[PDB]
Amino acid sequence: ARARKGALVQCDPSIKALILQIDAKMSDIVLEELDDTHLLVNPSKVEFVKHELNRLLSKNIYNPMD
Amino acid sequence: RPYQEKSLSKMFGNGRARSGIIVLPCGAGKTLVGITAACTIKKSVIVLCTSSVSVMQWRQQFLXXXXXXXXXXXXXXXXXXXXXXXXXXLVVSTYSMVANXXXXXXXXXXXXXXXXXXXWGFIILDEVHVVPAAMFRRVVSTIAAHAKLGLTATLVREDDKIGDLNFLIGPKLYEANWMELSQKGHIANVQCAEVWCPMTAEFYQEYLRETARKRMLLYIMNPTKFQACQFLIQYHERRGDKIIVFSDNVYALQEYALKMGKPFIYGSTPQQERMNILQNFQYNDQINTIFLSKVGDTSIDLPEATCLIQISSHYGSRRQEAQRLGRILRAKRRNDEGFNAFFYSLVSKDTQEMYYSTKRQAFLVDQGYAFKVITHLHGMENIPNLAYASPRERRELLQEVLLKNEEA
Numbered sequence: 387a388r389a390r391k392g393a394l395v396q397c398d399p400s401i402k403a404l405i406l407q408i409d410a411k412m413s414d415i416v417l418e419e420l421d422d423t424h425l426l427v428n429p430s431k432v433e434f435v436k437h438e439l440n441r442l443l444s445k446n447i448y449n450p451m452d
Numbered sequence: 453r454p455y456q457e458k459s460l461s462k463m464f465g466n467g468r469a470r471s472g473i474i475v476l477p478c479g480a481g482k483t484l485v486g487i488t489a490a491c492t493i494k495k496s497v498i499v500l501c502t503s504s505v506s507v508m509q510w511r512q513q514f515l516x517x518x519x520x521x522x523x524x525x526x527x528x529x530x531x532x533x534x535x536x537x538x539x540x541x542l543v544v545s546t547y548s549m550v551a552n553x554x555x556x557x558x559x560x561x562x563x564x565x566x567x568x569x570x571x572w573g574f575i576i577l578d579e580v581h582v583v584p585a586a587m588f589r590r591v592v593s594t595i596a597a598h599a600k601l602g603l604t605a606t607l608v609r610e611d612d613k614i615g616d617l618n619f620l621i622g623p624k625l626y627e628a629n630w631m632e633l634s635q636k637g638h639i640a641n642v643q644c645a646e647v648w649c650p651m652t653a654e655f656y657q658e659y660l661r662e663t664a665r666k667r668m669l670l671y672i673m674n675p676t677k678f679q680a681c682q683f684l685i686q687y688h689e690r691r692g693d694k695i696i697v698f699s700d701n702v703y704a705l706q707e708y709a710l711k712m713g714k715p716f717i718y719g720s721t722p723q724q725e726r727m728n729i730l731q732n733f734q735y736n737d738q739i740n741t742i743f744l745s746k747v748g749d750t751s752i753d754l755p756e757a758t759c760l761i762q763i764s765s766h767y768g769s770r771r772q773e774a775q776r777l778g779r780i781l782r783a784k785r786r787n788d789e790g791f792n793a794f795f796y797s798l799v800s801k802d803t804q805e806m807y808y809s810t811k812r813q814a815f816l817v818d819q820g821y822a823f824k825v826i827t828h829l830h831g832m833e834n835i836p837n838l839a840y841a842s843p844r845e846r847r848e849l850l851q852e853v854l855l856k857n858e859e860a
Contacts, residue, residue, distance in 0.1 A: 399653045400802050407660070422653075448807050451814065 392417050393429040401439070408438055455633065456485050459626045463489060471622030473580055473602035477630060478753070479639055479782040482603040483513045486576050489601060491517070495573030496541030498566070500550075500591065503751065504529065506578055507544045514542050526566070533562045538571060550594070551587040572597045577621065580604035581775070584613035592620055606778060608771040608815050630782075631820040640758065640784040640793040644816045644823035646809065647684070649676040651800045654850050658857075659803065665766075666860055671803045672704040672764050673853045675840035678711070682839065683832040684761060684796055685712065685741055694733075694757035695741040696780065698773070699764035702745060703856075708763065709743040711839065717748040730754075749776045753783040760795045765805055770812035778819070796826075 395405065399422050409415035415435060418426035427435055459474050476482040490497045499510050507529065514520045526536035526543040536543060543566065550563055566572075575595060577583065580602040602621050607614050618624075633639065651659075651674060659670045688695045699705035702718045709716035715729040726748070732739045733754065740757075742748075760780055765773065781793055797813075799806035813823050832838065840849050 400651060400656050403653055403657050403660075446802065446804075449810060451811070 391429075392426040393432050394420075395425045395427050395432070395435070396423060397425075399423065404439065404442055405435060408435060408442070453481060454636065455626075455628050456481060456488075459485060460488060462625055463492060469598070471600035472625035473604060473607075473617065473622060474625060475604060475607070475627045477628070477633060477639065477782040478605050478779050479637075479785045480628075480633070483510060486510075486601065486603060487513050487517050489599075490542065490574065493574045493599060494540055495598075496536065496538070496543070496566075496571040497574040497576060498572060498595075499542075499544040499576040499578065500547060501544055501578045502547050502582065504546075505751070507546075510544050528563060528566070530557065530559060533559070536566065536571060541571060547587060547591065550591055567594060573599065575600040575621075577602050578604075580617060580621065581607050581609060581614070583617060583620070584609065584611055589620070605782070606771075606775045608774065608818065610768065610771065629820060637785060638787045638791050639782050640791050642781055642816070642819075642821035643792060643794045644797075644813060644821055645795060645826045646797040646799055646806070646813065646823075647680055648825065648827045649674065649680045649798065649800050651802055652676070652846065654846075655853070656802060658850075658854070662857065666857065667804065668701065668764070668766075669703070669856055669860065670853060671800060671805050672699075672701065673707070673849065673856070674800050675846050675849055677763065677798050677800060678708075678840045679832060679835075679838045680798060680828070681708065681761070681763065682712070682837065683829070683835055684759075684798075686835060686837070687829070687831065688759040688794075689740060693740075693759050695759045695761060696754075696757045697741065697743045697761045697763065698749065698776070699743065699745060700766040700769065700773070701764040704764045705743050705745055712741065712743075714741045714743055715739060716743040718745045719747055721747070746776075749779070753779045755783045755785070758784065758791075758793050760793070762795070762797045762809075765809060765812075767805075767808055770808050771815055774812050774815040774819075777816075 397405070402423065402425060405416060405425060405427070414428060415431050416425055416427055420426060455476070462472070463470065474482065474485065476485070486499070501507055501510070507527070511520060511527070514525055519525060523535045524537045524540055526541060527534045528543055528545045528549065530546070530549055545563070549559070552560060572595065575597050581604055582588070600621055602617070630639070634641070655670055655674055659667055662670050685695055697708065699708070705716060705718055715732065717726050717729055729742065730752070733742050733756070760777065762773070777795060784793060797809050799809055816823055840846055
């Protein structure tokens with residue numbers, strides 16, 4: 387009977403935990419935890435939530451191979 | 453072997469005043485090249501070794517040539533001594549015995565007689581990749597001959613000191629390509645393969661909350677690594693091939709060893725039990741999966757088991773694992789029409805250890821070996837004997853890993 391607007395994010399559980407860490411560092415990110423592979427996230431952050439993801443997967447991967 | 457005469461042609465070119473490094477596989481006959489050079493020079497030859505088994509092998513090569521008992525071929529060790537004679541000599545010494553500092557067991561004078569009387573003329577250093585260290589610089593600083601030779605199999609290290617050997621002993625003269633040698637002699641085809649296993653959520657968040665070497669205790673103890681490990685073990689046992697499991701960590705080797713119910717060899721282990729496990733691996737067909745640590749790999753390499761599994765690993769020591777892997781690969785030679793050697797690297801996604809194992813695979817690319825990635829071989833879903841496949845066993849294993857973190 388209620389309807390709220392958000393951003394449905396579908397990803398693997400590891401990326402879900404990473405997004406929960408983004409919400410744990412910056413706040414005002416994740417609105418709800420739907421299941422193991424979906425999340426309700428503030429739309430105005432999605433691009434950021436994406437870009438930061440790249441950053442946190444750029445700090446994790448390393449691999450300069452030089 | 454043709455490449456051995458290709459190396460001896462350089463000695464046949466100039467003759468006098470020469471020094472360099474010759475790269476030959478462990479399965480090749482570099483000791484035969486040392487014997488031939490000793491026959492060409494005919495002088496007091498000293499062979500620097502780090503283990504007594506290599507001394508016994510060099511003595512066996514001396515027996516393959518001629519003479520060892522008469523007062524000419526000497527033996528230097530911490531147990532006994534043997535006299536020598538000029539104009540011709542063959543002796544093997546230990547790095548730790550010649551180095552030392554002030555500890556003495558009334559034997560450093562016996563070495564300072566071989567170094568004081570000036571009975572030399574040919575230098576042979578086994579495994580030159582270990583030379584980058586102060587003790588070896590002291591050994592070179594306490595010796596001086598007319599011709600020097602460096603027998604080694606590898607030289608990949610990240611200490612940025614391998615280039616110094618170009619002036620400490622001499623620049624590398626001949627580097628044999630292991631692929632062309634594989635065409636000359638089937639030294640087991642190298643199939644490099646990384647197994648990408650999924651990572652659970654709890655071990656992922658706990659893995660991120662951990663750091664340093666403690667997070668390795670959360671990277672190895674992943675349930676999917678146990679499931680894929682059992683799948684590879686049962687698969688190789690179904691193919692009728694023996695399995696060798698490597699682990700840089702002793703605790704993980706004991707965990708997988710006790711959970712798989714197979715013999716294990718690690719540090720502080722009695723030598724009689726090690727020899728018993730070796731004989732059971734050589735003769736008993738019921739033991740086709742052994743768990744070997746660095747002690748079981750550096751001391752002895754067996755020509756059996758075409759299945760090599762890698763689970764535990766340490767940061768930076770990827771080149772050493774590539775050298776040991778190369779030793780197990782070169783140790784398997786018998787000229788077979790098939791002869792497919794399989795190296796598996798059990799790695800989990802989003803972990804800090806796979807990104808160094810990729811550097812190890814880069815070392816495996818520099819050698820010309822073939823590398824391919826493997827996400828998952830279909831067949832593990834049909835194995836009901838897999839452990840830690842149920843959420844109950846995954847939670848219990850999680851509690852055991854948490855207790856292990858509380859102990860460390």
